[PDB]
Symmetry: D2
Subunit: 115 residues, 4 copies
């Protein structure tokens, strides 16, 4: 599992469950090609998006569907989603954890990169 | 000024100066059209992006070029840029401030919407 | 004004207004002595806390009464308050801005130190 | 393990390892009594601070020694430490995760509370 996404809810103080996540990879044509997608678990975590083989060098965009999350909770948020865009594996394979903390008018994200 | 962007640097404890910022508006074909742009001032602020007349309801993307900012500082960054995507909605008089706090491997953004 | 505090609300997307803020300075017996206090304005800002003459080097604690703020809004909070503890150091001319972003179960704070 | 502390480094994109953490509990006299302490592991996590029996109702302060962390890395940070102050177990025993993300001039903290 070279790519994991973890999402917490800053209003409730809990994992953000059932959050849709889409990952895209920039193609030769400079367009965003679909790469992988999933939904966070009861722990707010999304594993198994990809494999070491598939997760090649490239520029990736992780889109976390925060709007759908807030609206399912009956709340009208500010952002359409939270986006994390980064070059990956440029110096060899790494394991990436993309963590995001959500509030209706704000989000914060950080990356943990390990060898 | 219905739209303002403010960027701070969490490493140096200072405004993030001379940071490039691009704003796009979503078009009917779902593509992103350039809408406005600029560079943050010595106070980390970017004013004068647009006018009330131009800033109609719609979906907007604010891209903050954090990678270049960190590069100019000799610091190794994670993200290509920071992205803030939101719908602008006409609910009485509203000024939008997009604030972003930058670290090499993390960013945090909030919106302040006031009358 | 060598010391300014600014507080924003991540739930409502607005300045955090009328928030009580207490500043203490560490005394020789390691106790915290009241130093300055106030309430944030309609812009979420608290100015006029101290003067250059009074604001000498030392260790300071800024306590932001977030619990009361959330209570006044009918929202259930986690923290008793938000605390920012720092040493003030005379390195040329310096203004300190303590910024805090509030959510019910989270807070984020940064310092901006400018000349 | 009703109390866990997790600390990440926003400059390096990694767990913050070997960070000292002290927990205090407010006593009848309104003073801060030492409650527990430890250091984060290679994963940035601190488990085993306390037990369900010892972790009674009360107001707790978790002090994360961010200054010592940054200085050990040869960096001069702004904060003396990061403090998280909260009432715990007021409606029965809960499990608390206190997460903190560190930059030299900024920190962000959130709580996950589960039943
Ligand atoms: C506290 C929100 C904030 C910032 C500065 C961008 C912020 C953003 C995200 C965080 O996690 C913490 C602070 C800010 C907003 C308006 C200002 O004039 C100054 C600062
Ligand atoms: C401290 C980073 C973090 C979070 C929670 C997503 C975070 C992210 C950004 C911030 O500004 C503050 C906290 C987190 C990472 C791994 C976990 O298992 C739990 C929490």
């Amino acid at each position: 599992c070279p790519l994991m996404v973890k999402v917490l809810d800053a209003v409730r103080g809990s994992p953000a469950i059932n959050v849709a996540v889409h990952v895209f990879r920039k193609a030769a044509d400079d367009t965003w090609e679909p790469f992988a997608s999933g939904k966070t678990s009861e722990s707010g975590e999304l594993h198994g998006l990809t494999t070491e083989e598939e997760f090649v060098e490239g520029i990736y965009k992780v889109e976390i569907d925060t709007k759908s999350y807030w609206k399912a909770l009956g709340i009208s948020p500010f952002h359409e989603h939270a986006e994390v865009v980064f070059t990956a594996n440029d110096s060899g394979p790494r394991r990436y954890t993309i963590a995001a903390l959500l509030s209706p008018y704000s989000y914060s994200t950080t990356a943990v990169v390990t060898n």
